[PDB]
């Protein structure tokens, strides 16, 4: 089993630059005979099937335009993407087809942008939800950049760590910034024993952090 | 134009046997090579079978992982490639891509997936719970199994300003949300919906965001 | 036909 290793595991470039990532493969596959490479390459967009973008090392897929360079032979190989734009954030995979088929771990592309403040949001147990036994507290903090950001949740002043359920967004294509929500769930009862909840965020594009409060 | 349509994902039990199919469509589907690719939760892919044109009497080739176990075949007359998977085991979750793959080049088309899910856990409907406060309302769709779960604004009308959070799995039980935000006007004038769509379990709620 | 890097037919 030829295994192919890529690198970086990540990258962050700025639209406008070009991008160089890099595939080896366990064996070599350059053939003999036809003297070609048989080294593919592919991308994945967030939430899309995955796109061939160049097959035999360097040749470009059909209508995939000429930003595409693959290169390399034998045992390395590269990709280069040039005016790299908002349009091409996704995870590139290297495959081989010398003998039966074998990918590699993807290297995932991301585009530095300008920082951007989150836009948070908290939102009270539905009258539904608290019918049920439940209650969850949910805050949204969208729209930001870089992805790090810290969320605590604070119960009449006191930090509930236990029971927080985040998830962030992948970057989005067109503005390129990140989302996250965070999910407070406590009992009815529990609910019922306290008054002002808070969403509290920490990011660097602000000296103080981000308070999304409501008193039950 | 190429089409490439597979269907009969689902939750199965650990060695169950489950078959998928795809349609193929815009091509000449009896002379090319066609392929499964999966992807596991979250993993990169991985590519599963082929079956190489009748002019290549059929060939058939497996991943050392899958061999013995699934058996690709096809039928050129309907244009369909199939994937009858048995002994199936919990490795085996994942999205499954059908694959136009010409033999020599690479692999052209791939389809849009169909989920499958290998575990004992049961079929769990989704509670659909309405965040109510440019003002942004949300969407809470908790507590469902398997994935994947489809959730839309206004059937469709609300695209832009959405932003739906990927699920994440808790006590055997999944949870996600969606957050939409329309400028103060449209709301509450303009009707908002939460379009939820759960087909492990035939659901789909209608959630307005009213307040 | 036999090879998975073929490319030539055969019956």
């Known amino acids: 089993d030829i295994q192919l290793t890529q690198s970086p595991s990540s990258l962050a470039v700025s639209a406008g630059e070009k991008v160089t990532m890099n595939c080896k493969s366990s064996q070599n596959l350059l053939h003999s005979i036809t003297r070609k490479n048989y080294l593919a390459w592919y991308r994945q967009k967030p939430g899309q099937s995955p796109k061939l973008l160049i097959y035999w090392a360097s040749t470009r897929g059909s209508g995939v335009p000429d930003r595409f360079t693959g290169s390399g032979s034998g045992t390395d190989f590269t990709l280069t993407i040039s005016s790299v734009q908002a349009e091409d954030l996704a995870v590139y995979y290297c495959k081989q087809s010398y003998n039966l088929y074998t ?102 594009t602000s000296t103080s952090p981000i308070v999304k409060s409501f008193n039950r | 134009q190429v089409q490439l349509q597979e269907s009969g994902g689902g939750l199965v039990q650990p060695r169950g046997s489950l078959k998928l199919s795809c349609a193929a469509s815009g091509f000449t589907f009896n ?26 009497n059929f060939a058939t080739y497996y991943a050392d ?13 309907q244009s369909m490639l199939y994937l009858q998977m048995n002994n199936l085991k919990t490795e085996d979750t994942g999205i499954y891509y059908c694959v136009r793959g010409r033999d020599g080049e690479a692999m052209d088309y791939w389809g849009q997936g169909t989920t499958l899910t290998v575990s004992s856990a049961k079929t769990t409907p989704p509670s659909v719970y309405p965040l109510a406060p440019m003002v942004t309302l949300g969407c809470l769709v908790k507590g469902y199994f398997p994935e994947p779960v489809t959730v839309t604004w206004n059937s469709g009308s609300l695209s832009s300003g959405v932003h739906t959070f990927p699920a994440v799995l808790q006590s055997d039980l999944y949870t996600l949300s969606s957050s939409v935000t329309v400028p103060s006007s449209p709301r509450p004038s303009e009707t908002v919906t939460c379009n939820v769509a759960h087909p492990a379990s035939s659901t789909k709620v209608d959630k307005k965001i009213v307040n | 036909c036999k090879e998975w890097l073929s490319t030539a037919p055969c019956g």
């Open chain 1, 103 to 204: 990918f590699g771990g993807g290297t995932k592309l991301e585009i530095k942008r300008a920082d951007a403040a989150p836009t948070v949001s908290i939102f009270p147990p539905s009258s539904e939800q608290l019918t049920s036994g439940g209650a969850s507290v949910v805050c949204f903090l969208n729209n930001f950049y870089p992805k790090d950001i810290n969320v605590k949740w604070k119960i009449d002043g006191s930090e509930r760590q236990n029971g927080v359920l985040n998830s962030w967004t992948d970057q989005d294509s067109k503005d390129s910034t990140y989302s996250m929500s965070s999910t407070l769930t406590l009992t009815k009862d529990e609910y019922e024993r306290h008054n002002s909840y808070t969403c509290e965020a920490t990011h660097k």
């Open chain 2, 65 to 77: 992982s899958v061999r013995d176990r699934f058996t690709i075949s096809r039928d050129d007359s």
């Open chain 2, 31 to 56: 002379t090319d090579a066609m392929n499964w690719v999966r992807q596991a939760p979250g993993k990169g892919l991985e590519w599963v079978a082929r079956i190489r044109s009748k002019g290549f």
